[PDB]
DNA sequence: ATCGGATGTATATATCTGACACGTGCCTGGAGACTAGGGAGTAATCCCCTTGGCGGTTAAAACGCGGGGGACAGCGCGTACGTGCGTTTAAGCGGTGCTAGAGCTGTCTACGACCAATTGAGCGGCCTCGGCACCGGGATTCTCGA
DNA sequence: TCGAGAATCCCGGTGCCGAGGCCGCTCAATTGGTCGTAGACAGCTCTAGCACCGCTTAAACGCACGTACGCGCTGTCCCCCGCGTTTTAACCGCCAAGGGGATTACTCCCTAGTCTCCAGGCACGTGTCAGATATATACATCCGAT
């Protein structure tokens, strides 16, 4: 059992992610809203992944199921 | 013996051949010298084009002849 | 000692992270985040590793596009930095809330 | 019996025509798949993959390397604009973004 | 039942006019045509304008028969007086002079209004087919003439002449040896058979010598026209709705053309940024250069937005340069 | 067992457009998914296109109508001007 | 002494008066002449059965309304009240075109 | 006679200025500045051309000349904005 | 025996056999199963009842008895849980929700 | 002789509001809506029938597709009505 | 605008490694020839629907004149955040050890395509009538100058 | 904070045309039989996901400190709204021609299906070289100073 692991996405890593996009100064309140957006997006993808891998009556989320669950939403993912 | 093949660009190419070699060997030698694939080559002399199965001796070609080369598409 | 002006190390980090192509979020926090958020559904999942890496690449390509959009939406207000009322505008114009 | 000569060579193509035919029949896209179709489909797929790979190899040769690595594929897809709208919703793995800084953020 | 007999400046073949005028759109009349002919022939020679300025001006009475009757009856005696003056100590205008651009535009408009009778019937075709019809204006064809300088050893073939004003403008502009225009569907060709006769009569009436031309009827995908395509200099096609099916066959039949030839089309045969490598040798794009013309207005007569025109040229040295530089 | 791919055909068509530059493995997987995705989208559009006219044979015209819908306004001309050159040389043999 | 409202309150009458109703807003017959002029290309004459013209009018009206309802948010974000071209050109770029 | 197909030209002025103002008042703005009335015309011309250039293909494929409402519904379904209320 | 339709054994209101004849000749699989179109008619009937209840509920509150399409528009968008199914649908003769922003009020 | 879903929508309306009828253009809108939902659900069941090397859309693939297309609230009521419908169809 | 210090970035070689070009055995999916049944092509015919034109009435577009509210620029201040530094923590690499579960194979009961016979559920045509748009006339609500 | 006046909801009377219902009537739903096979279930080998442990150190954390910028205020001017007056073409109703959309019948050639034959392409080893890392170094860039 694990709990309170959203603090793994730390402060300078989110700063690096903002650095890749082309921003200059990160204000002191982004470090909560970005964690919120990431939690919503990961919940809304894994709720389509676990159903797909439950339909085959197996218990492993393999990579093809994640590719299909992203192809349903709108951002399709190559490389797999 | 040497013969010449005059193309359109101003370049003259000279090959050394014998009258008994087939035209396929001439096209292979030109392909060796300039890199042009044999299928694209259409050689013309005195208004008559040469056939694949014949030889230079069949057309009464001689020393120091000038031949004309034109380029054609692939198929 | 020598000290740069504030606002120049950032414009070198821009080039250093745009030229590269590595992953950014460290791995073992991300895998624990994915394993913890999947405990809310069917119990005792396993998560074959290539799925975790694929999910990480998707989770990076989401946030990079979101930040590159909210930077435009913050430059529009004649400001330079970003702020919560720019993410909460770009994510509403995009059509997810 | 005649000599067995494959259908890909009869049209001057390179992608396998028979594989495209076996995929259009088994994929339940219609009742009956016509014989004139999968030649055309193999040809369109082969033209699209040649148009991606030419720009990919050009960006690979420009960056002093000889193996095409996926960062070159990202730098060849997004930089042209006629190939962007077909791939407008893909995230290529190990991709990276184009080098791009806005005009305001540069120092005075 | 009376006529409105004019007289020609040089020679004697007076064109006639039946009095109930052919109806046009809500603002165009044949009185405009007759007054415009009189104004252009007054701009032709100034002695007729000197006889025109006194006792009468360009303005009119349109519905009345007697006013236009007086127009013709003064114009005829004016032409007869300068015929008597022309047999004095002066020598006439030289017959071998090609006309200007405005006289040519008015003559082409006059022939196209006089020849075809119900131009709504030209829209009777097969939908989304090669059979479709679309006319090219006078102005872009004049720019086409003034773009490529064609010399005394050329042949102008018009694939898809339509009604055939294109070959008329070409045969009146330059001085080539011969011309050709071929077409399949009979409904424009039956108008073309009268277009020929009316053009010859009117260019005799103005006294302007042209080139030679034969508006032929055929089908250019049969084996008869292959050797005639491959023996010609400049080719005018208009293929905005030909589709890709006959386009590949025209791509094949263009490959046996001579050196220094030219091809124009409303859709480009070879793309503008055509790179060349060891794969696409089978296309005809490897041995031709393309250049976009000037997108000026009034281009076609199916829309109003201008369209480009993509002048080609045949130049077999790009293949020679690429095969020389493969080894470097 | 043996699984299907598009690998060696992509590697064959690379040599005709470049002499001596090979692709790495993770680029081969990317092209192997890209050709599969474009083929899936084209057949999935031509299926519904042959369904709105009550026919049942996806012929060599349905692909030509779906390709001018999927691809944008520049690649469509080259796609059809290569497809016709494929089919015409297929018939006359 | 002639009665005249404050400039800036007839608009907050027209907002409710047009949001309550559901009639068509753009004039019909100039819109039909526009949609026949756009399809005046492709050379072959077309026919435009009238139910398709009205369907196209409903679709081409329900695309400008969402664009203005989003560019109002983009204009309020810059601490202004009116809208301006560099807000429509922001909303169309953030939307993904 | 004169030429066939009496050509419609310069016809973006049908979407006139108070019509675009009414369309704005649907959205919930207050003051429209003096330069929207060109960009809205540009956006509308791009959208109508990008729908008609799919409806004409969908009606070419059946070899008929009438662009029927099913074709507009299908061409809007393929872009992303589906449309009910017309049989599709 | 006596002819009895398949809806009556289902306890449903949408027809069953029409969904079967659509699922076979629409090319969605090769062999269409037996127990599936009953389930499909069930989910379709529950969805249309869930829309029409809110449609009539906002139709009676506006002093009319014919459900005009504006009532359908004001019944889908006013709800929250159905906004993500028709989330990119423009219902014809529709109109927009009554909405003025919080800054524009005088 | 074209089809519609008019008469069954008119039948299911009376089980909620027994004194209100609907107009024609609303009937066409509901007719399109049921058609679109059926198209989406069968089109998702088809693509779910190919990621498992099977070929029969049985009464499980429709349930797994309905738990994906509809959002988080309506899915519970949809599945809890569908399983009741199939367990009533079985015992007959 | 001109100049030095100091730091980072890119440019020029050396080794060493694991991922890539390639050759071989071999299996199964592609090709060749042949036959049977139907979906598509083509021709002829009806008739509904799209265009074209006109004429009257008038809503709505077009145009101009105050003038007030708001876009925009300049200026001053006070917090919040960039940059660097010393202390600190898990990140990560490797290595071992374990086993649940992915994946292939062998049957074969049950389950769904297919077809002839039967008939009622459902669709088009045709009617009746009342819910509803319209109009006009007061009763209530909102805004703006004092 | 109160009066005048424009706008808006409300109430009753009036005509109309689009829903509800009823009736021929036909063709798609339903019953009752076969028969071939996709898939439920058992049983087996073995890939790879998981937990744990130790060592190196790159990176996450707390903090001092200085400064560029977020933000509020004031002032100016400009431009867009409200309203009255004057054009213009939008809209409704009617009338009339004919062309294309749908339909029906009748052929016929393209294409599923079957059997047989064989090489195209895939898994596996095995070599070998493109570049990853490391080191020394010249040029560009930022920052104080003039
Ligand atoms: C776009 S019109 C060009 C008319 C005229 N030359 C012009 O430019 O205005 C194309 C013409 O080509 C003719 N055409 C189309 N297909 C043809 C064919 N297959 N064989 C001969 N003529 C054809 C048509 O009759 C049509 O008149």
Distance CA C71, CA C75 (A): 6
Report whether B49 contacts B20 (CB < 8 A). no
E91 is in an annotated binding site: no
Distance CA I106, CA I102 (A): 10
Report whether E48 contacts E42 (CB < 8 A). yes
Distance CA G58, CA I93 (A): 8
Beta bridge pairs of residue E263: E235
For chain J, say whether H88 makes contact (Cβ under 8 Å). Answer: yes
For chain G, say whether C90 makes contact (Cβ under 8 Å). Answer: yes
Report whether E97 contacts E208 (CB < 8 A). yes
| DSSP summary character for residue E21 | P
Q: What is the DSSP string of C40-74?
A: GSSSS----HHHHHHHHHHHHHHHHHHHHHHHHHH
Which structural technique was applied? cryo-EM
SS3 E287: helix
**Which residue ranges form the domains of chain D, and what is each CATH number?**
1-108 (1.10.20.10)
Give the max Cα distance, chain A.
48
Residues whose CB is less than 8 angstroms from the CB of residue E58 and which lie 6 or more positions away in sequence, other chains included: E35, E39
Burial class of residue D86 in the structure, from the number of CB atoms within 10 Å of its CB (0-12 exposed, 13-18 middle, 19+ buried): middle
For chain I, say whether G8 makes contact (Cβ under 8 Å). Answer: yes
- Torsion angles phi and psi, residue E157, rounded to 5: -110, 135
Distance CA H39, CA H37 (A): 6
Q: At what angle do helices F25-49 and F7-15 cross, to 10 degrees?
A: 110
Q: Which residues in chain D touch residue E277, judged by CB atoms under 8 angstroms apart? A: 54
- For the record, the structure tokens of E35 come out as 């007054």
Nearest residue of chain H to residue E29 (CA atoms):
H1
Q: Which residues in chain D touch residue I28, judged by CB atoms under 8 angstroms apart? A: 28
Q: What share of chain F is helix, strand, coil (3-state, %, to 5)?
A: 65, 5, 30
SS (H, E, C) B1-58: CEEEEECCCCCEEEEECCCCCEHHHHHHHHHHHHCCCHHHEEEEECCEECCCCCEHHH
Nearest by CB: F85 against E248, E278, E279: E248
Tokens 């997004």 locate to: D78
Quote the number of domains for chain E: 2
Beta bridge pairs of residue E59: none
Q: Which residues in chain H touch residue I104, judged by CB atoms under 8 angstroms apart? A: 28, 30
Cβ <8 Å between C75 and D104: yes
| CATH code for the domain in which residue E231 is found | 3.40.50.150
| CATH code for the domain in which residue E109 is found | 1.10.260.60
- For the record, the structure tokens of C5 come out as 């002006």
Distance CA D91, CA A79 (A): 9
Residue B34 distance to chain E (closest CA, Å)? 7
Report whether C50 contacts A63 (CB < 8 A). yes
Cα distance from N-terminal residue to C-terminal residue, chain B: 33
Give the up-direction half-sphere exposure of residue F1: CA atoms within 13 A in the CB hemisphere: 2
Element (H or E) spanning A31, and its range?
A: helix A30-55
E134 is in an annotated binding site: yes
Cβ <8 Å between D100 and C18: yes
Give the up-direction half-sphere exposure of residue D107: CA atoms within 13 A in the CB hemisphere: 8
Chains I and D touch (3+ CB pairs under 8 A): yes
Beta bridge pairs of residue A77: D91
Domain range enclosing E35: 1-123
Distance CA G48, CA D73 (A): 44
Please check whether residues E163 and E273 belong to one and the same domain.
Answer: yes
Distance CA E303, CA H41 (A): 19
**Which residue ranges form the domains of chain A, and what is each CATH number?**
1-80 (1.10.20.10)
- J5: how many CB neighbours lie within 10 A of its CB? 20
- For the record, the structure tokens of G26 come out as 């753009």
Mutate to test the pocket of ligand 1, among E183, E195, E299 (most ligand atoms within 8 A of CB): E183
Nearest residue of chain F to residue D40 (CA atoms):
F83
Q: Which residues line ligand 1 (CB under 6 A)?
A: E 130-131, 133-136, 158, 160-162, 166, 183-185, 188, 219-220, 238
Last residue of a domain, one of E76, E92, E123: E123
Report whether E181 contacts E164 (CB < 8 A). yes
- For the record, the structure tokens of C93 come out as 């114009």
J residues 51-80 lying closer than 8 A (beta carbon) to A: 51-52, 60-61, 64, 67-68
Q: What share of chain H is helix, strand, coil (3-state, %, to 5)?
A: 55, 0, 40
SS3 E234: strand
Candidate CATH numbers 1.10.20.10, 3.40.50.300, 3.10.20.30, 3.40.50.720; the one for domain G1-97: 1.10.20.10
Beta bridge pairs of residue E159: E182
Give the max Cα distance, chain F.
50
Beta bridge pairs of residue H32: G83
For chain A, say whether F40 makes contact (Cβ under 8 Å). Answer: no
Distance CA E87, CA B2 (A): 74
**Please, what's the b/e burial string for G1-36 (b: 16 or more CB within 10 A of its CB; e: otherwise)?**
eeeeeeeeeebeeebeebbeebeebbeeebbbebbb
Report whether I83 contacts I77 (CB < 8 A). yes
Burial class of residue E104 in the structure, from the number of CB atoms within 10 Å of its CB (0-12 exposed, 13-18 middle, 19+ buried): buried
Residues in chain D: 108
Distance CA G44, CA H56 (A): 10
Please check whether residues E168 and E310 belong to one and the same domain.
Answer: yes
Distance CA D64, CA C23 (A): 23
Q: Which residues in chain H touch residue F49, judged by CB atoms under 8 angstroms apart? A: 61
- Torsion angles phi and psi, residue B68, rounded to 5: -110, 130
Domain range enclosing J88: 1-92
Angle at G27 between CA G22 and CA G30, to 5 degrees: 150
Distance CA E62, CA E67 (A): 8
- E115: how many CB neighbours lie within 10 A of its CB? 20
Element (H or E) spanning E110, and its range?
A: helix E101-115
Residue C19 distance to chain D (closest CA, Å)? 7
Nearest by CB: A20 against D91, D97, D102: D97
Please check whether residues E15 and E143 belong to one and the same domain.
Answer: no
Report whether D92 contacts C10 (CB < 8 A). no
- For this entry, resolution in Å reads 3.5
Instruction: Name the residue among F26, A77, D81, F24 with its Cα closest to residue C54.
Output: A77
| DSSP summary character for residue I16 | S
Which partners does chain D have (≥3 C-beta pairs < 8 Å)?
A: A, C, E, F, I
| CATH code for the domain in which residue J49 is found | 1.10.20.10
- For the record, the structure tokens of E242 come out as 């030909």
Distance CA F6, CA F13 (A): 11
Distance CA G58, CA G49 (A): 15
Beta bridge pairs of residue E264: E236
Burial class of residue C17 in the structure, from the number of CB atoms within 10 Å of its CB (0-12 exposed, 13-18 middle, 19+ buried): buried
Burial class of residue E116 in the structure, from the number of CB atoms within 10 Å of its CB (0-12 exposed, 13-18 middle, 19+ buried): buried
Burial class of residue J89 in the structure, from the number of CB atoms within 10 Å of its CB (0-12 exposed, 13-18 middle, 19+ buried): buried
Report whether F31 contacts F23 (CB < 8 A). yes
Q: What is the DSSP string of G72-90?
A: HHHHHTTT-SSB-HHHHHH
Beta bridge pairs of residue H82: I89
Instruction: Name the residue among H82, F31, F44 with its Cα closest to residue I86.
Output: H82
Quote the number of domains for chain F: 1
Cα distance from N-terminal residue to C-terminal residue, chain E: 84
Q: Is the dihedral of CA E80, E84, E85, E87 positive or negative?
A: positive
- D29: how many CB neighbours lie within 10 A of its CB? 22
Distance CA G38, CA G34 (A): 6
For chain H, say whether J29 makes contact (Cβ under 8 Å). Answer: yes
For chain I, say whether G22 makes contact (Cβ under 8 Å). Answer: yes
E183 is in an annotated binding site: yes
Mutate to test the pocket of ligand 1, among E160, E225, E266 (most ligand atoms within 8 A of CB): E160
Report whether I41 contacts I19 (CB < 8 A). yes
Element (H or E) spanning E159, and its range?
A: strand E155-159
Nearest by CB: D50 against F13, F60, F62: F13
Q: Is the dihedral of CA B31, B35, B40, B41 positive or negative?
A: negative
Round to a whole number and report the distance in Å from the CA of F48 to the C1' of K48: 29
């Amino acid at each position: 059992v694990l709990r309170d692991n959203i603090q793994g996405i730390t402060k300078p890593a989110i700063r690096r992610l903002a650095r890749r996009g082309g921003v200059k100064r990160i204000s002191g309140l982004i470090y909560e809203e970005t964690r919120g957006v990431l939690k919503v997006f990961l919940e809304n993808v894994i709720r389509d992944a676990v159903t797909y891998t439950e339909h085959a009556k197996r218990k492993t989320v393999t990579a093809m199921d994640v590719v299909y669950a992203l192809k349903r939403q709108g951002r399709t993912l190559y490389g797999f | 013996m040497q013969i010449f093949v005059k193309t359109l660009t101003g370049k003259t190419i000279t090959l050394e051949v014998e009258p008994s070699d087939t035209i396929e060997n001439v096209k292979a030698k030109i392909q060796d010298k300039e890199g042009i694939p044999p299928d694209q080559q259409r050689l013309i002399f005195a208004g008559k084009q040469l056939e694949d199965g014949r030889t230079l001796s069949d057309y009464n070609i001689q020393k120091e002849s000038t031949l004309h080369l034109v380029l054609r598409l692939r198929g | 000692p020598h000290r740069y002006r504030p606002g120049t190390v950032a414009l070198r980090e821009i080039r250093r992270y745009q030229k590269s192509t590595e992953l950014l979020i460290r791995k073992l926090p991300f895998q624990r985040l994915v394993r913890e958020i999947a405990q809310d559904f069917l119990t005792d999942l396993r998560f074959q590793s290539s799925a975790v890496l694929a999910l990480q690449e998707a989770s990076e390509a989401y946030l990079v596009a979101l930040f590159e959009d909210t930077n435009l939406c913050a430059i529009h207000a004649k400001r330079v930095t970003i702020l919560p009322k720019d993410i909460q505008l770009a994510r509403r114009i995009r059509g997810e809330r | 019996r005649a000599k067995a000569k494959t259908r890909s060579s009869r049209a001057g193509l390179q992608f396998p025509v028979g594989r495209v035919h076996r995929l259009l029949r088994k994929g339940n896209y219609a009742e009956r798949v016509g014989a004139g179709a999968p030649v055309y489909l193999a040809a369109v797929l082969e033209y699209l993959t040649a148009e991606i790979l030419e720009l990919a190899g050009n960006a690979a040769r420009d960056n002093k390397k000889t193996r095409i690595i996926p960062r070159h594929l990202q730098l060849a897809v997004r930089n042209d604009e006629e190939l962007n709208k077909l791939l407008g919703r893909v995230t290529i793995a190990q991709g990276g973004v184009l080098p791009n800084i806005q005009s305001v953020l540069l120092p005075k | 039942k009376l006529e409105l007999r004019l007289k020609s400046p040089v020679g004697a073949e007076p064109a006639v006019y039946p009095w109930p005028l052919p109806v046009y759109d809500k603002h165009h009349d044949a009185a405009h045509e007759i007054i415009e002919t009189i104004r252009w022939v007054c701009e032709e020679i100034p002695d007729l304008k000197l006889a025109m300025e006194n006792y009468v001006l360009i303005d009119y009475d349109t519905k009345s028969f007697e006013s236009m009757q007086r127009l013709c009856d003064k114009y005829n005696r004016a032409i007869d007086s300068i015929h008597q003056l022309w047999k004095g100590t002066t020598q006439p205008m030289k017959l071998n002079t090609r006309p200007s651009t405005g006289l040519l535009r008015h003559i082409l408009q006059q022939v196209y209004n006089h020849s075809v009778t119900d131009p709504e019937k030209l829209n009777n075709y097969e939908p989304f087919s090669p059979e479709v019809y679309g006319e090219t204006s006078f102005d872009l064809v004049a720019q086409m003439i003034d773009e490529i300088k064609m010399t005394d050893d050329d042949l102008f073939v018009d694939l898809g002449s339509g009604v055939g004003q294109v070959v008329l403008q070409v045969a009146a502009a330059t001085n080539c040896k011969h011309h050709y225009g071929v077409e399949k569907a009979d409904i424009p060709a039956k108008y073309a058979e009268t277009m020929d006769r009316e053009f010859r009569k009117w260019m005799k009436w103005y006294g302007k010598k042209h080139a030679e031309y034969t508006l032929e009827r055929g089908d250019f995908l049969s084996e008869e026209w292959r050797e005639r395509i491959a023996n010609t200099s400049v080719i005018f096609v208009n293929n905005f709705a030909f589709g890709p099916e006959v386009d590949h066959q025209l791509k094949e039949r263009f490959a046996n053309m001579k050196e220094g030839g030219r091809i124009v089309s409303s859709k480009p045969f070879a793309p503008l940024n055509f790179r060349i490598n060891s794969r696409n040798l089978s296309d005809i794009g490897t041995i031709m250069r393309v250049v976009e013309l000037s997108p000026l207005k009034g281009s076609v007569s199916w829309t109003g937005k201008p369209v480009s025109y993509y002048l080609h040229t045949i130049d077999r040295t790009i293949l020679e340069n690429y095969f020389s530089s493969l080894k470097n | 067992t043996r699984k299907e791919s598009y690998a060696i055909y992509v590697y064959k068509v690379l040599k005709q457009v470049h002499p001596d530059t090979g692709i790495s493995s993770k680029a081969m997987s990317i092209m192997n998914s890209f050709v599969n995705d474009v083929f899936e989208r084209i057949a999935g559009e031509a299926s519904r296109l042959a369904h709105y006219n009550k026919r049942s044979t996806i012929t060599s015209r349905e692909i030509q109508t779906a390709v001018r819908l999927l691809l944008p306004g520049e690649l469509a001309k080259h796609a059809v001007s290569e497809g016709t050159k494929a089919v015409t040389c297929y018939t006359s043999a």
